[PDB]
User: Fold this.
Amino acid sequence: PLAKDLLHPSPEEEKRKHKKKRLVQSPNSYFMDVKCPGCYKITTVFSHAQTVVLCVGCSTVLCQPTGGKARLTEGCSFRRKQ
Amino acid sequence: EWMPVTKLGRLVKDMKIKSLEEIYLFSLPIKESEIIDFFLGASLKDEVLKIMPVQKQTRAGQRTRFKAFVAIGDYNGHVGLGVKCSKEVATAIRGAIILAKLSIVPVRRGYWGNKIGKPHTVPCKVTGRCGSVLVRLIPAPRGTGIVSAPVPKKLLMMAGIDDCYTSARGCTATLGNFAKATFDAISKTYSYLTPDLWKETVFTKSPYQEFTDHLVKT
Amino acid sequence: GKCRGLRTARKLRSHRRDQKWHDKQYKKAHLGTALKANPFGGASHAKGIVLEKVGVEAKQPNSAIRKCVRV
Amino acid sequence: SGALDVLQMKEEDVLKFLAAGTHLGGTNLDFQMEQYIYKRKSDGIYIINLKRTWEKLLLAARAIVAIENPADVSVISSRNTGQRAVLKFAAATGATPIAGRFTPGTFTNQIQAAFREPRLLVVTDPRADHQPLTEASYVNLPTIALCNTDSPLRYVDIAIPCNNKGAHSVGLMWWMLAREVLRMRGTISREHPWEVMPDLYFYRDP
Amino acid sequence: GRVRTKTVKKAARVIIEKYYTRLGNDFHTNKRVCEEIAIIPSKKLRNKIAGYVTHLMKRIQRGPVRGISIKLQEEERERRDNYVPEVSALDQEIIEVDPDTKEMLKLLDFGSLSNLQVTQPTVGMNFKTPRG
Amino acid sequence: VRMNVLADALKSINNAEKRGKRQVLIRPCSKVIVRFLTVMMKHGYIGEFEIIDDHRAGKIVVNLTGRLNKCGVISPRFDVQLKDLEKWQNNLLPSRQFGFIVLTTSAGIMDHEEARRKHTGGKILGFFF
Amino acid sequence: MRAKWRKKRMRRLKRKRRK
Amino acid sequence: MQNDAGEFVDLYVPRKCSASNRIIGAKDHASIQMNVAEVDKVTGRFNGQFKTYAICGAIRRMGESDDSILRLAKADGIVSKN
Amino acid sequence: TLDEKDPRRLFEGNALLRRLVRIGVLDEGKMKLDYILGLKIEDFLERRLQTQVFKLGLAK
RNA sequence: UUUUCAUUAAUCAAGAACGAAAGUCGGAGGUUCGAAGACGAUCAGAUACCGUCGUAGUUCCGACCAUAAACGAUGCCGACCGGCGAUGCGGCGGCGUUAUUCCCAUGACCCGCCGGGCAGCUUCCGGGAAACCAAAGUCUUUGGGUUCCGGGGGGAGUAUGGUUGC
Assistant:
């Protein structure tokens, strides 16, 4: 109270505070690449995704549509991009 | 004879504190009328606003006490208001005058237009609130007079405000609330910040901190 | 809440104009209904012929026979 | 401390602090006292940063030594825990102690024989004795308090963050303040450790 | 019923804290000394004071009576308030500290302390009182 | 929904100053607010402020000095002439010594004293003292 | 009297008046 | 303050609060003027010099007198940076 | 209330001051518009023929 | 939600949808309760309270009727202004218990966070005549937008006129 730098808030407080009520807006979502166990081809998926996505490489389900972030199938390893 | 009980009292009796402005600067409590009777006794006049009979219903019948409203002030920017309830009018008056002396405050004056000679009016448009009653003081031109009801005219004259424009809202028939409202309105004049009072204040030594050397003896 | 918009002059005037009727003095004055009911009909003084003298009793707290004339 | 090597806290001081358990806070945090807290842990207990605790103790000491007549400086304890600690402090520093029951109007009512106009007030637990802190609002009296993780800051000018529930901790804090004040004044030196020991400032329950 | 009034109470008290050494347990001795001690208005009043003095002088040995400056027990109270153990209570052999406190210490350049032992933090997360 | 963004901006600053906060956040940010704040700063009431620029519509963070008593908006934007300006500065300002009415004129957004000096009327935006 | 019974009397009076 | 003559026409210049920069009133009994001592750089002894802070009733009542004293002490270099 | 450079204020002000100097409730030194506000009823009642006839010692 | 349209909005004379209980028409059925009414008590009297019975009604289907202390006696939309622990729905992160044998992964707990709701406790933010209200605050330091609406108490929600309805 009474002294906070509204200009330079601490980055942990910035991330905690709501995406729309931040000092400058940025989404909590991200783009990640999926490595399917029974395939060599790489695919990119949205963290909160809405459609069951298919890898045309081996024709197998990758991520499931959920209330929030899309749950990936067992074996398929996800890695953050930039 | 007067033998003070507060440290400020003993300081005032030993001619240590020069003017009452020093006390109002450091904003100390005043619990002895004899301090005011020292600095301002020569130029103080007091006026009885009214004597209100107030009652308490008891089994026997009504009980009666008198509320004495009394205003005190010298006509050089010093006014105070006392209110006391008692069985006898005289005891109420005397007690009220003591409370009136204790409750004196300094009154900041000002100019309507160009600043030439001594200040004659209120500096800004100030307001005072009390139990429904609103009283607003407004700067008036030189030699206008006090345009108001008698009750605020008493306190504004006793505050040494030469010219002023008054507007009151609420139940002004309640003289206690009306007198309290206008007194608070006057009292607010120094609490109001104005651009010529913007400079960074210089911290003077406190009279308790200053003359500790004398209070150990006396 | 009062409409303050630059083009609300009609709304304010219309409201103020029709809300003046709920004032006791204005309605009694402007509506020509008090005048016809008033025995003098908006005249300070009026002249008449006496019918009879009559003694009207005062209110409850103080008793006396007030002398009056039916005219 | 003024960022000077002479006023930096030593290994013995932090060992003395950690012994009593002054770093153990309460379960609750007040929004004003968040700045002094280190981190919330499992078990519910908050931890107070000893560096900032030291900084506020040095600021408190700096405030106490500023006053000329040591009799003016007043010290209050309501709870049984901080009684001895205060009676000891007043003996060493030369302050005016009030112990146990605090009579309302003590600083305000001028006619009472026990009337007193102090120039400072050092409090044990601002929750425990709200009356003197409240009275301080009527007489322009600056107030220093040994605040816990949970405590109201209404009429508290200097808030030393530290454990209050530990009988050792209160005595140790009072001992440390007493030492810092007498050291700052120049009655005792920084080379020789002070001959008085912290247990002298502790509470002995029957 | 019969309750001792503020008069006999106040009188009895100030008599105790003035002439504690003079009084004892026996009523009749206290009755006889109360005559010499105080100018007292009547025999009944003196008897009642002597009686309550006797009553207080019983319970003074049992424990310290509140608001009676005897001056004797103040000496041993001052002795009990000026006692220090030979070794300092703060001097433990090894101080058992939680990790985050060691983290808090090592961020203030106190990471070299070997007197402090770091016990493993609690495995279960639950501290709050069951509400309802 | 939100109408007269200046109203929210001035009300936000007013509440912040009454509460005693040393900084205040204003959103969104427009030219009118920036010019109004510039006029308030030039006379030494607020001091330095920063325009946090996101692509949508900027925010302002204003450093607050303990000088500002009141900063009010006048809605709607009344048509003010030179002859009627005495009446306005008599009504709104607390004293003739200090305080300023901010008019938007063909010259620009400026205080009433500069409006008299440059001799041009306009629309009243707000006042501060 | 009670305001609900003032209203009921008024309606009984309006019924006999109209007829 | 000053008329066109030149002389200052006022009873007393009131003290402004060090924290909030509001005028401390005549009957502001909750207002505090605290003196903080200055140490000698080498020995760390009370040299005699002191630095004064004033806090108004509002800031005392709010419970922000603590942070206001602390941040003033930080600014004036009494309390060590960080 | 009018500005210090206005022809109307200048002309009217000078005419008023000239007339109040002419009647004898001011002097050439105190001949500023601001000082008009610092007059009172005494100043005007002094200029009655009755008062002057008394003050010059024609009447006793 | 790192999807789309790109100002499409807010509040509203006229004009609309719905609207407890009772009430009025036609059909169905009638267990309980029960206006009216019949008795038995109490009482100076009781046209009531208490008790036994009982018509219309209470229930369902299709037409009307448009009112309640229809209440939070508090219009709707938008901004700002103090803390605190719960709670309901969704999401986010994280030790450890348990069930689906086990690994993850879902449930049940546990500790935090974020948004929108039902509220509560505390506070000299500030208001108010106060009772009280984190809104009933940001009001003489008086202007965010807009609808309905009061002007001492009775007469009176009466009279008349219009219009809706069996």
About this structure: The radius of gyration of chain D is 16 Å.
